[PDB]
Structure 1
Amino acid sequence: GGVMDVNTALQEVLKTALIHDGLARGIREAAKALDKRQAHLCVLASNCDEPMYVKLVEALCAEHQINLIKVDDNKKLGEWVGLCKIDREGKPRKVVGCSCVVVKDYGKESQAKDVIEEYFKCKK
Protein backbone atom coordinates (compact mmCIF):
# COMPACT_ATOMS: atom_id res chain seq x y z
CA GLY A 1 0.00 0.00 0.00
CA GLY A 2 1.32 3.37 1.20
CA VAL A 3 2.03 6.52 -0.80
CA MET A 4 5.56 5.16 -1.46
CA ASP A 5 7.49 7.73 0.52
CA VAL A 6 10.27 6.11 2.54
CA ASN A 7 9.48 7.89 5.81
CA THR A 8 5.71 7.44 6.18
CA ALA A 9 6.13 3.84 4.94
CA LEU A 10 8.65 3.07 7.68
CA GLN A 11 6.07 4.53 10.09
CA GLU A 12 3.50 1.88 8.99
CA VAL A 13 6.20 -0.73 9.86
CA LEU A 14 6.77 0.89 13.25
CA LYS A 15 3.05 0.75 14.24
CA THR A 16 2.85 -3.03 14.26
CA ALA A 17 6.55 -3.43 15.12
CA LEU A 18 5.76 -1.82 18.50
CA ILE A 19 3.16 -4.54 19.15
CA HIS A 20 5.56 -7.21 17.83
CA ASP A 21 8.25 -5.91 20.23
CA GLY A 22 10.76 -6.08 17.39
CA LEU A 23 12.55 -2.90 18.47
CA ALA A 24 16.15 -3.51 19.45
CA ARG A 25 17.12 -0.22 21.05
CA GLY A 26 20.66 0.46 22.28
CA ILE A 27 23.97 -0.93 21.06
CA ARG A 28 23.90 -4.25 22.96
CA GLU A 29 20.48 -5.18 21.60
CA ALA A 30 21.33 -3.76 18.15
CA ALA A 31 24.41 -6.00 17.99
CA LYS A 32 22.44 -9.02 19.20
CA ALA A 33 19.68 -8.29 16.67
CA LEU A 34 21.96 -8.31 13.62
CA ASP A 35 24.17 -11.13 14.93
CA LYS A 36 20.80 -12.90 14.96
CA ARG A 37 18.99 -13.54 11.69
CA GLN A 38 15.65 -12.49 13.20
CA ALA A 39 16.24 -8.86 12.12
CA HIS A 40 14.90 -7.76 8.75
CA LEU A 41 15.23 -3.99 8.79
CA CYS A 42 17.82 -1.50 10.03
CA VAL A 43 17.66 2.28 10.24
CA LEU A 44 20.57 4.41 11.43
CA ALA A 45 20.97 8.14 12.18
CA SER A 46 23.49 10.96 12.87
CA ASN A 47 26.15 11.10 15.66
CA CYS A 48 24.51 10.48 19.06
CA ASP A 49 27.45 9.67 21.29
CA GLU A 50 30.33 8.76 19.00
CA PRO A 51 31.12 8.92 15.27
CA MET A 52 32.37 5.36 15.87
CA TYR A 53 29.04 3.57 16.19
CA VAL A 54 27.68 4.96 12.86
CA LYS A 55 30.70 3.24 11.26
CA LEU A 56 30.33 0.06 13.38
CA VAL A 57 26.64 -0.40 12.37
CA GLU A 58 27.70 -0.41 8.69
CA ALA A 59 30.49 -2.87 9.59
CA LEU A 60 27.88 -5.23 11.09
CA CYS A 61 25.57 -4.83 8.06
CA ALA A 62 28.55 -5.90 5.91
CA GLU A 63 29.40 -9.07 7.83
CA HIS A 64 25.90 -10.30 8.66
CA GLN A 65 23.00 -8.80 6.70
CA ILE A 66 22.80 -5.77 4.42
CA ASN A 67 19.48 -4.06 4.95
CA LEU A 68 20.61 -0.60 5.98
CA ILE A 69 18.60 2.63 5.68
CA LYS A 70 19.80 6.01 6.95
CA VAL A 71 17.37 8.58 8.34
CA ASP A 72 19.27 11.27 10.20
CA ASP A 73 18.54 13.16 13.43
CA ASN A 74 18.64 11.08 16.64
CA LYS A 75 15.66 13.09 17.91
CA LYS A 76 13.52 11.53 15.16
CA LEU A 77 14.05 7.91 16.28
CA GLY A 78 13.96 9.07 19.94
CA GLU A 79 10.48 10.49 19.45
CA TRP A 80 9.41 7.43 17.44
CA VAL A 81 9.92 5.02 20.34
CA GLY A 82 9.30 6.41 23.82
CA LEU A 83 9.69 4.50 27.08
CA CYS A 84 8.51 1.25 25.46
CA LYS A 85 6.14 2.75 22.94
CA ILE A 86 5.59 6.31 21.73
CA ASP A 87 3.86 7.94 24.64
CA ARG A 88 1.75 11.08 24.96
CA GLU A 89 1.19 14.14 22.81
CA GLY A 90 3.79 15.65 25.15
CA LYS A 91 6.38 13.82 27.25
CA PRO A 92 9.25 16.08 28.41
CA ARG A 93 10.81 13.47 30.76
CA LYS A 94 12.37 11.82 27.71
CA VAL A 95 12.56 12.41 23.96
CA VAL A 96 16.19 11.15 23.85
CA GLY A 97 17.46 9.41 20.71
CA CYS A 98 17.43 5.69 20.09
CA SER A 99 20.11 6.46 17.45
CA CYS A 100 19.48 3.26 15.50
CA VAL A 101 16.81 0.61 15.76
CA VAL A 102 16.34 -2.79 14.19
CA VAL A 103 12.92 -4.32 13.58
CA LYS A 104 12.06 -7.97 13.06
CA ASP A 105 10.35 -9.04 9.83
CA TYR A 106 8.71 -5.63 9.37
CA GLY A 107 6.90 -6.09 12.69
CA LYS A 108 3.83 -7.96 11.48
CA GLU A 109 3.40 -9.23 7.92
CA SER A 110 -0.38 -8.97 7.86
CA GLN A 111 -0.98 -6.12 5.38
CA ALA A 112 0.73 -3.16 3.64
CA LYS A 113 4.15 -3.45 5.38
CA ASP A 114 5.43 -6.05 2.92
CA VAL A 115 4.78 -4.06 -0.28
CA ILE A 116 5.88 -0.59 0.88
CA GLU A 117 9.21 -1.83 2.19
CA GLU A 118 9.93 -4.35 -0.62
CA TYR A 119 9.57 -1.54 -3.17
CA PHE A 120 12.48 0.32 -1.55
CA LYS A 121 14.64 -2.57 -0.36
CA CYS A 122 15.77 -4.24 -3.60
CA LYS A 123 16.78 -0.81 -4.93
CA LYS A 124 18.52 0.20 -1.69
Structure 2
Amino acid sequence: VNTALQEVLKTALIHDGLARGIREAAKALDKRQAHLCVLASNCDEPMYVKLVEALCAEHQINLIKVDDNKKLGEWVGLCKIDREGKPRKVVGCSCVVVKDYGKESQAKDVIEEYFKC
Protein backbone atom coordinates (compact mmCIF):
# COMPACT_ATOMS: atom_id res chain seq x y z
CA VAL A 1 0.00 0.00 0.00
CA ASN A 2 2.81 2.39 -0.88
CA THR A 3 0.57 4.43 -3.18
CA ALA A 4 -1.84 4.85 -0.28
CA LEU A 5 0.97 5.77 2.12
CA GLN A 6 2.06 8.32 -0.51
CA GLU A 7 -1.45 9.80 -0.65
CA VAL A 8 -1.71 9.94 3.16
CA LEU A 9 1.69 11.65 3.43
CA LYS A 10 0.62 14.10 0.73
CA THR A 11 -2.60 14.91 2.57
CA ALA A 12 -0.59 15.46 5.75
CA LEU A 13 1.56 17.88 3.75
CA ILE A 14 -1.59 19.60 2.47
CA HIS A 15 -2.95 20.03 6.02
CA ASP A 16 0.47 20.99 7.47
CA GLY A 17 0.69 18.34 10.19
CA LEU A 18 4.10 16.69 9.62
CA ALA A 19 6.86 17.80 12.08
CA ARG A 20 10.17 16.86 10.41
CA GLY A 21 13.99 16.69 10.64
CA ILE A 22 15.66 14.57 13.27
CA ARG A 23 15.82 17.48 15.69
CA GLU A 24 12.19 18.54 15.36
CA ALA A 25 11.38 14.84 15.58
CA ALA A 26 13.19 14.60 18.93
CA LYS A 27 11.18 17.64 19.98
CA ALA A 28 7.89 16.09 18.86
CA LEU A 29 8.78 12.80 20.63
CA ASP A 30 9.49 14.73 23.81
CA LYS A 31 6.28 16.78 23.49
CA ARG A 32 4.51 13.47 22.70
CA GLN A 33 3.13 14.77 19.41
CA ALA A 34 4.32 11.75 17.40
CA HIS A 35 1.72 9.29 16.18
CA LEU A 36 4.25 7.44 14.03
CA CYS A 37 7.90 8.06 13.29
CA VAL A 38 9.91 6.71 10.40
CA LEU A 39 13.67 6.26 10.26
CA ALA A 40 16.17 5.73 7.49
CA SER A 41 18.45 2.68 7.55
CA ASN A 42 21.33 1.25 5.46
CA CYS A 43 23.30 4.41 6.18
CA ASP A 44 26.47 4.82 8.23
CA GLU A 45 24.65 5.99 11.36
CA PRO A 46 25.75 3.53 14.09
CA MET A 47 24.91 5.86 17.00
CA TYR A 48 22.18 8.03 15.38
CA VAL A 49 20.04 5.07 14.33
CA LYS A 50 20.62 3.46 17.73
CA LEU A 51 19.61 6.65 19.53
CA VAL A 52 16.43 7.26 17.55
CA GLU A 53 15.53 3.59 17.93
CA ALA A 54 15.84 3.72 21.72
CA LEU A 55 14.08 7.12 21.73
CA CYS A 56 11.12 5.58 19.94
CA ALA A 57 11.31 2.62 22.29
CA GLU A 58 11.34 5.04 25.23
CA HIS A 59 7.59 5.86 25.37
CA GLN A 60 4.83 5.28 22.81
CA ILE A 61 6.39 5.94 19.41
CA ASN A 62 5.65 3.68 16.45
CA LEU A 63 8.60 3.06 14.14
CA ILE A 64 8.68 2.59 10.37
CA LYS A 65 12.14 1.70 9.07
CA VAL A 66 12.57 2.76 5.45
CA ASP A 67 15.75 1.69 3.65
CA ASP A 68 17.37 4.47 1.61
CA ASN A 69 17.76 8.15 2.41
CA LYS A 70 17.58 9.23 -1.24
CA LYS A 71 14.40 7.12 -1.52
CA LEU A 72 12.90 8.60 1.65
CA GLY A 73 13.54 12.09 0.28
CA GLU A 74 11.93 11.24 -3.06
CA TRP A 75 8.95 9.69 -1.31
CA VAL A 76 8.32 12.63 1.03
CA GLY A 77 8.67 14.93 -1.96
CA LEU A 78 10.19 18.12 -0.50
CA CYS A 79 12.05 19.83 -3.36
CA LYS A 80 9.99 18.55 -6.27
CA ILE A 81 10.69 21.17 -8.95
CA ASP A 82 10.03 20.63 -12.64
CA ARG A 83 6.91 18.60 -11.98
CA GLU A 84 6.63 17.93 -15.74
CA GLY A 85 9.12 15.11 -15.38
CA LYS A 86 11.24 13.57 -12.63
CA PRO A 87 12.64 15.18 -9.47
CA ARG A 88 16.01 16.37 -10.66
CA LYS A 89 18.34 15.38 -7.82
CA VAL A 90 16.83 14.09 -4.58
CA VAL A 91 18.81 14.57 -1.36
CA GLY A 92 18.43 11.75 1.14
CA CYS A 93 16.22 12.42 4.15
CA SER A 94 16.51 10.20 7.23
CA CYS A 95 13.56 10.78 9.61
CA VAL A 96 9.92 11.85 9.45
CA VAL A 97 7.51 12.29 12.38
CA VAL A 98 3.85 12.47 11.43
CA LYS A 99 1.46 14.51 13.57
CA ASP A 100 -2.03 13.92 12.25
CA TYR A 101 -4.88 16.43 12.23
CA GLY A 102 -6.51 14.75 9.22
CA LYS A 103 -6.84 11.22 10.60
CA GLU A 104 -10.24 10.59 8.97
CA SER A 105 -9.25 8.59 5.88
CA GLN A 106 -9.58 5.08 4.51
CA ALA A 107 -5.86 4.70 3.77
CA LYS A 108 -4.93 5.83 7.27
CA ASP A 109 -7.48 3.42 8.74
CA VAL A 110 -6.23 0.55 6.55
CA ILE A 111 -2.73 1.26 7.85
CA GLU A 112 -3.93 1.12 11.45
CA GLU A 113 -5.62 -2.18 10.48
CA TYR A 114 -2.41 -3.49 8.89
CA PHE A 115 -0.64 -2.62 12.14
CA LYS A 116 -3.36 -4.57 13.96
CA CYS A 117 -2.61 -7.59 11.75
- Provide TM-score, normalisation by structure 1: 0.73
- Structure (1/2) with the larger strand percentage: 2
* Contact 1:43–1:70 (Cα < 8 Å) also in 2: yes
Does the C-alpha gap of structure 1 residues 84 and 24 become closer, same or farther in structure 2, counting only changes over 3 Å? Answer: farther
C-alpha contact (below 8 Å) 1:106/1:114 kept by paired residues:
no
Instruction: Assess if the C-alpha contact under 8 Å between 1:22 and 1:102 holds in 2.
Output: no
Structure 2 CA distance for partners of 1:30 and 1:48, relative to 1, 3 Å = farther
Name structure 2 gaps, 5 residues minimum. none
TM-score, length of structure 2 as denominator length: 0.76
CA RMSD of superposed structures (Å):
2.8
What's the CA shift for 1:14? 0.6
Aligned to 1:69, the other structure's residue is in SS state: strand
Query: Unpaired segments of 5 or more residues in structure 1?
Result: 1-5
Structure 1 match to 2:35: 40
Structure 1 pair 44/60, CA: closer, same or farther in 2 (3 Å)?
same
How many equivalent residue pairs?
117
Instruction: Evaluate the alpha carbon distance shift between residue 27 and residue 36 of structure 1 in structure 2; reply closer, same or farther with a 3 A threshold.
Output: same
- 1 CA distance for matches of 2:92 and 2:64? 17
Q: Deviations over 1:68-102 (max 9, x none)?
A: 11111111111123446787255666511220101
Residue 60 to residue 107, structure 1, CA distance change in 2 (3 Å) = farther
TM-superposed CA distance for 1:31, in Å, is 0.4
- CA separation of 1:21/1:74 partners in 2, compared to 1, >3 Å: closer, same or farther? same
More helix by share: 2
Q: Distance in 1 between matches of 2:5 and 2:39?
A: 13
